[PDB]
Design a protein around this ligand. Sequence first.
Ligand SMILES: [K+]
Ligand SMILES: [K+]
Ligand SMILES: [K+]
Lengths: 660, 660
Amino acid sequence: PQNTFLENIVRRSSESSFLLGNAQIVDWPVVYSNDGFCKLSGYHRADVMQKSSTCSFMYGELTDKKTIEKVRQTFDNYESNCFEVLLYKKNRTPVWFYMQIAPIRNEHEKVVLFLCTFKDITLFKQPIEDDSTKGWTKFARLTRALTNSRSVLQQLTPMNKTEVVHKHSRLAEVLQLGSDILPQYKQEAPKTPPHIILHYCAFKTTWDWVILILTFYTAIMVPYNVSFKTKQNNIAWLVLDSVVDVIFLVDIVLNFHTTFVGPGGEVISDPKLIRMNYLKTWFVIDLLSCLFSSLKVVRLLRLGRVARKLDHYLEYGAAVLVLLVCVFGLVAHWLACIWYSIGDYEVIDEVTNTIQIDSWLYQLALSIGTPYRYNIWEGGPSKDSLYVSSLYFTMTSLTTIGFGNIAPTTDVEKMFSVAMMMVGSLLYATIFGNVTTIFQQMYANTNRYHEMLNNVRDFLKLYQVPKGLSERVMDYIVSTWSMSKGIDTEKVLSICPKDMRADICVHLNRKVFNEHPAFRLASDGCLRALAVEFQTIHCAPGDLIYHAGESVDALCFVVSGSLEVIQDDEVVAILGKGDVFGDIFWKETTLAHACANVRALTYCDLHIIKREALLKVLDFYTAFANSFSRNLTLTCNLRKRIIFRKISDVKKEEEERLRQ
Amino acid sequence: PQNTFLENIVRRSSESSFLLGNAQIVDWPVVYSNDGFCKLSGYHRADVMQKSSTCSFMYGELTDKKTIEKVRQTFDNYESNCFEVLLYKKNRTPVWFYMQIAPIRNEHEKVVLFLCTFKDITLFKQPIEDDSTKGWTKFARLTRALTNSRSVLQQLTPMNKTEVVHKHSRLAEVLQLGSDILPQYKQEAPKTPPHIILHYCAFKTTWDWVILILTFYTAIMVPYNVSFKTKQNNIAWLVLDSVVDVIFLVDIVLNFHTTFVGPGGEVISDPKLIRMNYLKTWFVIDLLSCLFSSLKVVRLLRLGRVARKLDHYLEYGAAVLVLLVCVFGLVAHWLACIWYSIGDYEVIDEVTNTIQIDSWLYQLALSIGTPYRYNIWEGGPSKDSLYVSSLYFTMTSLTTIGFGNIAPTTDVEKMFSVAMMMVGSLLYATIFGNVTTIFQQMYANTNRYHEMLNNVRDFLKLYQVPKGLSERVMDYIVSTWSMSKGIDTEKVLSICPKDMRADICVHLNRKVFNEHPAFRLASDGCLRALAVEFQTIHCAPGDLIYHAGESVDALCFVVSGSLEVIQDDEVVAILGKGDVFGDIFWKETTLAHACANVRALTYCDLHIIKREALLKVLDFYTAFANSFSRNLTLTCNLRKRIIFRKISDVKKEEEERLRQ
Ligand SMILES: [K+]
Ligand SMILES: [K+]
Ligand SMILES: [K+]
């Protein structure tokens, strides 16, 4: 919902007369005399500063030939004019107009709320008032006493060695208007400049997960290529690397054409702000990562890219667990690469020509079976075996299992082992604490329900409650949790605003408003004033709703279940669905008591509205009380005692009368 | 804020007359006739015991030549006098004065609140009242009927074989006054005696972290030097050891000149208390640690020093994690030193001359490659390899990984291993439980926000709320958490005092007081009486604030957003920023209803003040109500219906009138 005349005009616009009009009986809204009419050009609000689309009441002079129907007619023409009518101004002069015209129709197809951006002048023609005629008071001071459209572009004398150039905001401003103004009626939603995409569309979503997948691929492939020195025979990987690099470069380019949330939580949409913000925030790192061994470790920063985007991901529970297991695998892989690099460095001393029998590649070669042979040193474990052994060792070390068939024995490997031990201990602790908490986050609610059940059971056992009452209490608790699964309405309604709470309650009833032929002629005033008062109740079988222990003070509505109005051990009516039972409240102003013993056959759901909160609303909306009185029929009028009389035992009464 | 005359005079001062005065119209404050004028020397409060800087009203005698303007003039002289005026005393005699004078001016430069420490006498000259003239009643009993400055130093007869020595509190007490009295006006803050430093300055902070760093250094270096027997060739370490020792000794000396918080939570500042407290509390341990193998284990007590200072550190989250990892490293290092000591003890039996093939140094030597050789037993693993192996083993044992390439096999090592196992299990459990809790302490708040979101989402899903209402509720919750991130104002305002709460609220408004030209002529009374009543509201787009469902009873102020006052499907005014809309309350004393349908264009923030809590304050401060009435202009007076009339359809009404 937007009338498209205020939201984004306080930044770029200038002096204008954004006439709206409403077009039923006489004048309504001219509204925006914005950007310069503060307290120095016209009236203030409640005047033609804010209404009377065709302006008046600021006249202050006589009705001359030009001062009647020239632009006063133009205001409701909407199309085009160039004449000169009078509208009073601070200059104390017979004001006439130089202006520009611009139409636009509607979205609702009503020929209302046009654009009509106007300028108005007083100076450029003539002052001829004799209020001050002391030489240069109105014949040369005219260039001083105007505070109008002149003060937008050309705030100097109208001559100023210039004839038509200074006519750009009074005579030739129509080229700066039209499509440069917001529309006359549209729909309010986050809108973007041309060739700009929002950050929550179906395009940026797919690219976010695509970039995440490619980053997860690079974080795996780059350390492997750096440590386990590979080859280039397969040109397939050589071209997929270029494909991924160019995809990331295209994403860097496309990041200029997106939207980001700023201070306060609103979608910012303007090319210059987007560009400079993205630049200053991430362009250095993005360029460094996009474009010899150290170059790949620099290239790894696309993982920090996903780290910055992490706020978009997560918060969904299962995704957190998947991310945690993925990062555990990633750190295991990185430690495997470092471990293999160390193991390859240690074997084969280059000072002499000998193989160091300590390392871990020599022990692995001895255990597997394939040894190192000299012919300069070639022949040993295959690359797949080396990688799988490195991963297996680092997984033994991270998971704190520890086997010992692959263990550090040299000097460098022990230092690296203690470093890995500290790092892995920290990561293990944090990661699996988070995993356990995430897994317990829902069994927390389940255990809340179980704790409620256990507390009720313990209370029933401790005080030695009989079997029937205990089983009824258990059944009621089970049913109430079944239809109210953990969710509590009071808090959710408390954290919402007043109007939104009223709307939520109105939709919560949904079966006593559009189902009962009484609440029909109420659009949005009575429905949102009564629903805040209706309260839903659930009643167990055998419960006495309005037995002879309470007075009738609530117009109860039945929406699900069945009730029988027991009167002296027997039933006079059996209420079903959509049958209101209760006392008349709006036309007696009295009180009575329970004329019956209303029970509940099955589990029932009723909608109580209190008496004092019922007739007040219909008294406020007097047009609704008439329909309410004329369209409500009480199925069981629990106000008057009925003449209740039972079939087949006055027979023996008459028999005894004839006998006695 | 301190007038410097009560805070610290009840411990050292004596009889005095600490005259203040206030100097505008007539008398005000002489105030402190402290330390002896309880109920036995003069009047009580509300008299020249507390006001009338120039004293009077305690006369009780006739106006003699000396009894008019001698010291009664001295009180406002402030400079010097030695004369004798009358001021009535319990002696029932024509009192005259022996006194001492002392001036001091101000801090605010006003020549007010001088020092004027006076003494007053009655005895030393003469009693000549004939009330009791029964011999030794006023000529010899004079030495009994005085209860004044005599009762401070020389409480005996004025003769007492002494002439001028007994004149030390009536004639020669000026040398015990002056700079020995607190000032006349200063600023209140924790102050220290000369050559005393506070415990939260920028000096003791740097020394606290310096001592912490040096203690962390010693706790690492001392066990290493004790176990791995080092040398002295590098004189560099030999001089850094002396430098650190002398630094710690200087710190022990400097601890005499610091301040410590005592009982109740106040900064104690007095050399004797500081000295004796520090001595009795820590001097034994500090001296023992400051100043052959056992001497270093004693020297290790500087770690207990940091343990005592620990309260200063910690409580910052990240510092807790850093401290925990540091102590884990420290215990690993200590266990490494003990393990190497055991391993060095076991190898090479001294009864025979043989090497024990069990230990762990022999197995390590066999695995590494360098064996033990005999020529008495020399040659083996280097010192760096020995230390790194010891650390690696103890880190395998503490982190509960366990590899087995270095494992206990002798008799002593198994007992030490089980002891280390129990100790490491305890330390592991406590340390990493604390680490996990500290890490979860902030994701607790994040998970509270996520739980609120999940509860709202579940409530919306369960009851099948339509799309528009659900999305509006989600947006409102997101915005409210965005600008109110976890922080709840009610609790923080509850735990604060009343005046501080009022000040916090006054600063919380900050945009309806110093921005609106109405709340200008109110210094501190009306602002702190109205801000406790103002409540801020946030309204979502499309919300109806004061539609035709409520009566106008609140002078709402707009500080951010925009509102349009819809009247019969169309708008008569569009409120902006700093535009108050509401009913007049202080000059009609009536009630009306919503003459409009005020909506909210964008997200808005308003400042409601209730009617009954508004005019009461301005009624209390009658000088403020005049300015409030004369300086408030309602932008949208939602009290009176305006004559609203719409432009361009009476045209067809007149057309039909001419047609029908
Ligand atoms: K093992
Ligand atoms: K283990
Ligand atoms: K083993």
